Design a protein around this ligand. Structure first.
Ligand SMILES: *C(=O)CNC(=O)/C=N/OCC(=O)NCC(*)=O
Lengths: 25, 25
């Protein structure tokens, strides 16, 4: 692995989810 | 550096995902 770490705060509501990810495996 | 962040924005059909690209390093 995944050439992209993960950093979000979820947010379903119609299927939403602020996904602010940062580079990095 | 603290740049290069794949700032994503999982957005439901209500809109259309999103990503603010502006990494400098
Ligand atoms: C319209 O095209 C809706 N698009 C999406 O919902 C797509 N976003 O997916 C972003 C994703 O999978 N990011 C993975 C890394 O965190």
């Amino acid at each position: 692995x995944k050439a992209k770490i993960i950093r979000y705060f979820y947010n379903a509501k119609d299927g939403l989810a602020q996904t602010f990810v940062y580079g990095g495996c």
